[PDB]
């Protein structure tokens, strides 16, 4: 090819973390305005923004080209600053993601998809009473799409684009699973914040800045 991404090293992953955190920060007020579940306290964007900034600050201060070591730095940053339901779940999604790659220097598209799925498994186990129509649902559907696409797609850019398309479809379907979302007329705020991070991931894979 030419401008495709076959492997993601530690600096590329740091770029996805930085641009994902920056895109979430740029949309934090919108994600806040959507927060009606479980308590309508309008803080999901702030909670996820503060959680991801903790991971972002750790990464920016301890860069590595070894993705497994970078992932440890990122994971610890999120886990020691996780705020609210959404930040806790976000830190657990990426705890499982980063644990899956801890011994790797770089990962390919199939390991990337597997890592999204590993994060979903970690997060569902961490939440005592998981509820559908939420950030868990969006993460689960995005991981299912990643795994299906990666078996025939070596380009991590094309994979991330497909992940985003199907995560968007899952997010738009969250009101059909969670009554309060349909009754108020909004998608899930936690899932919207997660999509904001995933869109930053794609920007970084394309060598772009948010
Ligand atoms: N029991 C649960 N299962 C799955 N997701 C949840 C649960 N409780 C809260 N959430 C997510 O957390 C978001 C709100 O986070 P926060 O405003 O930080 O409490 C919701 O929109 C959901 O996506
Ligand atoms: Mg609050
Ligand atoms: Mg809230
Ligand atoms: Mg480019």
Numbering used by the authors: -2 to 207
Question: What text appears in the publication on this structure?
Answer:
The FakA_N structure has a simple architecture comprising 11 α-helices arranged in an up/down barrel configuration. Located at the end of the helical barrel, the adenine is partially buried in FakA_N by the loop that connects helices α2 and α3 and to a lesser extent by the short helices α9 and α10. FakA_N is structurally similar to DhaL, the ADP-binding protein of the Dha kinases suggesting an evolutionary and functional relationship between the two proteins. Another difference is that DhaL has three aspartates (Asp35, Asp35, and Asp37) involved in chelating the two Mg2+, whereas in FakA_N, there are only two (Asp38 and Asp40) with the third Mg2+ interaction coming from Asn32. The FakA double mutant (D38A and D40A) does not complement the ΔfakA phenotype confirming that these residues are important for catalysis.
